[PDB]
Amino acid sequence: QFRAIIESPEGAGHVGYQYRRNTGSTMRMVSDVLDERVSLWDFHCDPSGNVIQPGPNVDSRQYLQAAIDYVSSNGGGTITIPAGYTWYLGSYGVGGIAGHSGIIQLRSNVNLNIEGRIHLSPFFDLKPFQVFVGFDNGDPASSGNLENCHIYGHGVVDFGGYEFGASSQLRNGVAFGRSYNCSVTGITFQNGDVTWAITLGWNGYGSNCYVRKCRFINLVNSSVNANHSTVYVNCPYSGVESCYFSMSSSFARNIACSVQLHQHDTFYRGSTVNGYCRGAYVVMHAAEAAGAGSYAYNMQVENNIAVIYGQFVILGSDVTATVSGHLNDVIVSGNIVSIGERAAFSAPFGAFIDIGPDNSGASNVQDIQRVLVTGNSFYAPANITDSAAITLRANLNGCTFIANNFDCRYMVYNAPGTTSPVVQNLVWDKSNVIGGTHANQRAGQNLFDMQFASVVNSTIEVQLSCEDLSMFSCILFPASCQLSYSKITVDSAWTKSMSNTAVFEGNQQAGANVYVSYPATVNLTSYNTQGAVPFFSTDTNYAWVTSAYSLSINENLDFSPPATYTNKANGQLVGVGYNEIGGVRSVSVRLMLQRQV
């Protein structure tokens, strides 16, 4: 019976087709052409083969898994998750992903085109979950790889608004696993309390994984949530570009970071962030060094836009019993960043760059060097005392700042009587512009507060662009901070009225290989001789000065002080001025003091 065959599930396999009636084309059956595509509807059926409508009382998980399993068996393809429907997930998956609280297991070469919505059912309320998992084993070390898996479309993953049940729980959207050529593009992740939205790689295993043109909206909502990083990049040659991240929770302002860059050759570009505590960590964790080595290098954070409450970029490296992690060859450029409206001390200490201790608080394990911070803007509102261009809280082996515009409370800061970092190769070029928003707010404060164990091979070229007479000093070194083989300068513009410009509480500017210059007021007295006549300082704290020159006009007719000075062994300054008429002269002059510059 022909009628019977046609009405049967093999019917389309009996109806002939030839593309556009082209006599040169293949003589196919309708089913062949329909078989070129596949959707969730092709697996979303009961045991008799009748289609099941999705909805809040239907658990779509087993059907989607069957679709992925079947396409995987044919070498791959793309499964569409249809538009105009919400597909709910309502149970855990089984096997290898159960160890990861997994819902769906991803498979190699099987792409998901999510055009409709995927939504978690209340079964998951107060429970852990990882929605899509690419590991195939509960132990990631024993997992196979996931390759050539792409998730893309105009659709949505909705985490149902459910809070965490316990802080120790973990929640994720996509864990690609040991992931090679995998990506998420176009998707909106929203409405949750999760740990991560996407994680790429596993402990350095993976390559060429990307997140592009995704949105992440309101993914922390509770005090229970221990920590949140929206994308964790844990394989090399991988990155995040052109994404949107937004949070509205108060809790997110204290715990949430947009991106973790944790392996070499990784990037974070062209993205916009609002409502987060932190922008990006750039870190080499020794505990994550298995797949790609012990070094994080070629790290790029560029051309992002951010409103955060804590720190924009945080650098780190640490050690384990048998591995040491190193961070080097980093670039941070083109970013425009602000600390959002908040009270002082109400969120983690505001910073553009933070050199942070390790997760246990250790500040003597880091090996961070060859970092370039250039062509960025940073702003914090004037009330935010806790705002810095760099908070330098752990050992630093080098960081270079060129041509940034920093408009916040401090330039360089570390809290006194906390950690005592060892600092090498800190370079603050004169082309860094220091803004004026916090003028008049700096009573008792040092603009560059050098609260370190030691500083070597460092450059700080201070250039103000407006007055701030509230500040205690432009730069201060406590006596506990050794300083050697360094260049510290304070340009005189906007400093004439400052009582202190640079302060060396241990007289460290006297060091043999310290090169400094800064303004000071000096009292001088002359001899009485008519004609060329010496002037000498009354104080004797200039034994370190190599030359000094006048920054003051001479209101006198009958004499002039020296234009330039040198020193004497007793620590006086001395120079030769001119008495048109004789007499002992006394003057108080603003000088530029110079040492070896």
Place this chain on the structure above:
Amino acid sequence: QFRAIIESPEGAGHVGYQYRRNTGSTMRMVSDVLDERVSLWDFHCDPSGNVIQPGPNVDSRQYLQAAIDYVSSNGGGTITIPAGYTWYLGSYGVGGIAGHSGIIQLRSNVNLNIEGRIHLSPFFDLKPFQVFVGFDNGDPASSGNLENCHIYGHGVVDFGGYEFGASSQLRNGVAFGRSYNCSVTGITFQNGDVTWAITLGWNGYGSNCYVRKCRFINLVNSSVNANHSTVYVNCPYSGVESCYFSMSSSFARNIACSVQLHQHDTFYRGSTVNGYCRGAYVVMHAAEAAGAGSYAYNMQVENNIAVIYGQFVILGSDVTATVSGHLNDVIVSGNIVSIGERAAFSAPFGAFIDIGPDNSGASNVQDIQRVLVTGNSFYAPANITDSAAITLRANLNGCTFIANNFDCRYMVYNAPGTTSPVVQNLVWDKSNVIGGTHANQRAGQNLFDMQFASVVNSTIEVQLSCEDLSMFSCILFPASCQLSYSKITVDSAWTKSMSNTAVFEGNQQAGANVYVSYPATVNLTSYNTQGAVPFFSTDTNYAWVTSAYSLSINENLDFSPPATYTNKANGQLVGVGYNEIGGVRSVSVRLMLQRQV
């Protein structure tokens, strides 16, 4: 009758199908699978249901609208506009979009995949039109939102070449309206005389709207066209990336801009522009402040390539009777820009940055601050007198330039006897490289022409990199410009032969908190004493000088002038030189004059 059913429109609904003969798959009908996609052909039919071929004598509008209306009713989806066909539009739409001269009404969740061509018929010649409109009401204030609407593909929107009929008319390609998560990707807009190609948002209402990888080609063609901006970004968290803009009309060189960034958290990146008057406006219009506040902040213009005839980036902010607009936290970086080949004064005044008055010409309403211009190149051909790094034509509350390369006629310019802007926090770092293309062209001109009412808290560090002895001065302040709490320096390199370096026509460099240095030639005479001997200037216009030092060699054996000088109350310079043999000496020396630096 089985034959009858099969031949009927329900026939495919009787032919069974099961994906790849998989026994676990859904037992569907052919029509179910065909129903997973939708195209214009599914609505492009006569009242009897017979398909109609598109073409220049068929108006496809009602069919496309029916398709959008129907898909909208099912929760959304993607309508394909087929490749290999041109689909003409030949009438106005009806209802809510009639108030916007709308052709097609877009609807939420309904995407258009434009693979073929859409082409306007001559019905639209000399008339207004907006091809795709997302408003649902003639009054945008009473409109609902458009959400999740994406237009993408390899296809083309062709505006038929028709000129405007009257200057007051408006024409647009896509007006998304009060638009949330909407985008245009891949599409070519060409061949028209329009006001805009795409507009995003409405008066700050909207979010997450983007234009990516689109082309805009020849969209102004007539003298009637009043004004053209290719993409208008009027909602936050939105932007333009990786687009191509080109014009060939002469009129475009005087009226056309590529992008308007008019709300916070907006960007313009990675794009190429040719043939336009202007690159981008970055503006907060008080009249547009309803949806997202009164501040435009986090504005980003980065890594674009442009050949324009007028100004690359134009900044603005203005007020209404009850709202004041503010612009702050802007970054302009990585752009390479030139003024195209043209006669001087033949297009609007060439500039990299323009600080422009409001639309009525007011220059005393702006609140523009915290702008960073860094790491850009600008070039204008040597004949273009009207070319500047910045034309500063309205009040400015701050702008910072670091590490740019500007190769044009002026660095800082405003026309004398026009507006008198009040300038604060203008910072021109010494790392800005001033090119040499216009050397020898600058007779009668000041490189930095400070034609302002006042300048405060500003820095100008001039550094030449080649000679230009044609210029009247490196920097000039008219007597009408107050100057205070500022730093103005002229490096001596390539200046030895200049008669004027810095010029203060009101002697403003004498101010208590002005910090300056610049070269000058000075005549000095000594006393006759053998030995250490004073030299004094013949002129008395140095009462403001704090120190000066020699920039000239000493061709004498029998004496030497002072290496360094200070001043005296009568305005003479004085220093101590050395007469090996006695005698009154007279010399003319090049000095670096310094005040408080």
Place this chain on the structure above:
Amino acid sequence: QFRAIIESPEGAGHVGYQYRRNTGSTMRMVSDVLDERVSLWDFHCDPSGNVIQPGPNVDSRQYLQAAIDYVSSNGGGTITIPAGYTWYLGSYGVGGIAGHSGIIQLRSNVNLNIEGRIHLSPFFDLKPFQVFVGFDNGDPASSGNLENCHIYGHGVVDFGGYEFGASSQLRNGVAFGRSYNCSVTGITFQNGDVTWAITLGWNGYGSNCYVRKCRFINLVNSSVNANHSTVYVNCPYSGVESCYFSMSSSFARNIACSVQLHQHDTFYRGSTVNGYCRGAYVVMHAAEAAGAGSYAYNMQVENNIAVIYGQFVILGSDVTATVSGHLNDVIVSGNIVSIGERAAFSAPFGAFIDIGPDNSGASNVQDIQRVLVTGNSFYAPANITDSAAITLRANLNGCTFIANNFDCRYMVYNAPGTTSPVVQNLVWDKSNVIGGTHANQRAGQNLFDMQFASVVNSTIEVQLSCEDLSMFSCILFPASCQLSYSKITVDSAWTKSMSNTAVFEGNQQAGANVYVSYPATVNLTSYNTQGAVPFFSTDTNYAWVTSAYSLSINENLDFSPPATYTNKANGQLVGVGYNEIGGVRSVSVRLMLQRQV
């Protein structure tokens, strides 16, 4: 017979369909809907119309060509190359592409969606080939254009691992030809020994061609391969963005470049490179000037990540008998680059920028100017003697460096007794940070080794950030290098112990329009007079010095040397110090020598 028609190839054309049972929709046949898409299966059939399975023993070429030819005839469309299959190509194409060793001929408006794999069969071993060719004629000058051709998908082009048979052979993946609005997106090119993977345009003919989000993996594998450039951009308004390039061969480290930018308005952005000799050439070849003029301008290399073995960006321009090529208006910004681990001299000389001779070795043909290198990082390991910020090997008409961080052996280098370039407008701003990795390695070497015929209108502002007492000098000019109208400065920080700072082997710092400053040690003797007393240098090689000042402390009580000095006609320095008590004094002081600064 109805049964007969239904089973025939016209069967689907008799089965009715109406979208979603919508009474307003078109009353179509199943075949109409199936005809909206097209795949390789629709042409991959034998002469009787039976489908043929692809595989290593089937040559899919004729079937894919038939598909492209047919779709082209209907106005275009998109052919899918199905996922889950490998499609082998095993013969050359015929006609116009035979002259290009072409396999498949691309056609206008016909896109390829490559979801599966395309793989070359061993027929191609040791032979030339170009897999996809858009020329339609063996002579490219007589070719028609290719327009609106896009290749995209998650699929793969695999070149079969075959080595080149002869060095003179050429191999390519995609040659778009005289190409307008063409692109490759998402595709992986791998496993070959080829000349290029993609070429865009032909000798300036073409426009709006792009390569985005592609991977290029292991595309050189033999010593026979003469030269490799992964993407060659030979039309304007075209570029490469967000790509991944990797090589593992030793040969690639000596021959392979990622990108060629060879026409105006072209870009290379956001890409990652590993294992290559070179990053990008930016060149105007006169021989390629036919389609778009003789000038390459608006050239952009930005925000790339690279590990290379030779040079990152190489600039060039050259001439033919009748055309002269010019390069100008270039920007290189935001790049983070390193020379990978290698022995010194084991690959082409390491550099960030190279100013290279033409292909015959000529260094006197170039017209390269208006280049900005800003905000980049460069690192080479300490053992790599052959590493430079710029190797300046051919005539240079201008290049500007601002705010970079260069950490390698040399800053400026050219080999002595090779070429003698004529240098104009070389600008090295003081904001360039010179790293310390190569400290102690520089015995016998000059950090800036100015091995040129002449230098004019140039600026070199040297600023160290750590000591390197191994170096012979910071900057050296041989006597053969003329120097005029230039500024050369050496900041004193970290230089106190250097015997030579700046060296002018021809005494070129004496030039009338040379502006210099650098530290030196000077021996001085005083007269015996008590009181103000002159000090004079013992040596007479300071006739060029305009002023000098002390960089040393004064360990004496009874006298002080001058703080500042000028010169005398005999070449002595002279200044006025102070003898508290009389006596002839002798001192050796570190001075900052200054000329016209």
